[PDB]
Amino acid sequence: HHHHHHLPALKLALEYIVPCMNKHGICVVDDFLGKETGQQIGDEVRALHDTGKFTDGQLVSDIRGDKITWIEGKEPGCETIGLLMSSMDDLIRHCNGKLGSYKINGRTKAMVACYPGNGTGYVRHVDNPNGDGRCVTCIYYLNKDWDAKVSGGILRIFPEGKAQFADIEPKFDRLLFFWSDRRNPHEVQPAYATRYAITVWYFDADERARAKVK
Numbered sequence: 001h002h003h004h005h006h007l008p009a010l011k012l013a014l015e016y017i018v019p020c021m022n023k024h025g026i027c028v029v030d031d032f033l034g035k036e037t038g039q040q041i042g043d044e045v046r047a048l049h050d051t052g053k054f055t056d057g058q059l060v061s062d063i064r065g066d067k068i069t070w071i072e073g074k075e076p077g078c079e080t081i082g083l084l085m086s087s088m089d090d091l092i093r094h095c096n097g098k099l100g101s102y103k104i105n106g107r108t109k110a111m112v113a114c115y116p117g118n119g120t121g122y123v124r125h126v127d128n129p130n131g132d133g134r135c136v137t138c139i140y141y142l143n144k145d146w147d148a149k150v151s152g153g154i155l156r157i158f159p160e161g162k163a164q165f166a167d168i169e170p171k172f173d174r175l176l177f178f179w180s181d182r183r184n185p186h187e188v189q190p191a192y193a194t195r196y197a198i199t200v201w202y203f204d205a206d207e208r209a210r211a212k213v214k
C-alpha cells in the first residue's frame with residue numbers, strides 16, 4: 001500500500017529503538033523489510049532446511065528440540081539473509097553510544113533457528129549469563145501468517161525485576177531487540193508448526209575484550 005513509507009534507520013533508531021531499549025530493555029519492530037524481502041528470506045531459510053544444513057540443537061548444548069545453522073551472509077543462496085544482517089547493522093550503527101553505556105564494535109554471524117513443530121520449544125534461559133561480550137540480541141522472524149492461538153511458539157520474556165512480562169509472536173517480518181544478559185530470561189513456548197527465526201548478537205567492545213583476556 002503506497003500510503004506507507006519506510007522510516008530511515010536513523011529515525012527508527014533514535015525515535016524508537018534507543019528510548020524503547022533504555023526504558024524496557026525490549027523493542028519490537030514490525031514490517032522491517034517488507035513482504036517481498038521477507039518472503040525471499042523465507043525461501044532461503046526453507047532451502048537451508050530442505051538441503052539439510054541444520055544441526056540438532058540438543059547437540060550444540062534436555063534444553064531444546066530446535067536445530068540451527070550459522071550464516072555469514074555472503075554464501076550462495078543466502079544473499080537476502082545477508083541484506084537482513086546489513087539492515088540490522090545499520091540500525092545498531094545509528095544506536096551505538098546511546099544503548100546504555102555500551103560500545104558496539106562487532107557481532108556474531110546469524111544463527112538461523114528452526115523449531116520443527118511437534119511441540120518443540122526452548123526452556124527459560126539467559127543468552128549471555130557469563131559476560132561473554134554479547135550485549136544485544138537481535139531476532140528476525142519470517143513465519144508467514146503465524147497464528148499463535150493454534151501454532152503457539154510465543155517468545156515469552158521475563159525482564160528482571162519488572163512487574164510485567166512480554167509475549168512476542170514470531171510474526172512475519174518482525175524484528176526484535178533485547179538485552180542479552182540476565183536482565184532478560186526468556187523461553188520459547190511449544191511450537192505446533194514449523195517456526196523459523198534468525199538471530200545475531202552484538203558485542204560490547206569492553207566486555208568482549210575482557211572476555212577474551214580473562
Ligand SMILES: Cc1nc(Cc2ccc(-c3ccccc3)cc2)nc(C(=O)NCC(=O)O)c1O
Nearest residue numbers: 066108113122126127128139155186188197201
Ligand atoms: C537456539 C536458541 N538458543 C538460545 C540460547 C543461546 C543461543 C546462542 C548463544 C551463543 C551465541 C553466540 C556465541 C555463543 C553463544 C547463547 C545462547 N536462545 C534462543 C531463543 O531465545 N530463541 C528465541 C526465538 O526464537 O524467538 C534460541 O532459539
Ligand SMILES: [Cl-]
Nearest residue numbers: 019020023024
Ligand atoms: Cl512508554
Ligand SMILES: [Fe+2]
Nearest residue numbers: 125126127186
Ligand atoms: Fe535465547
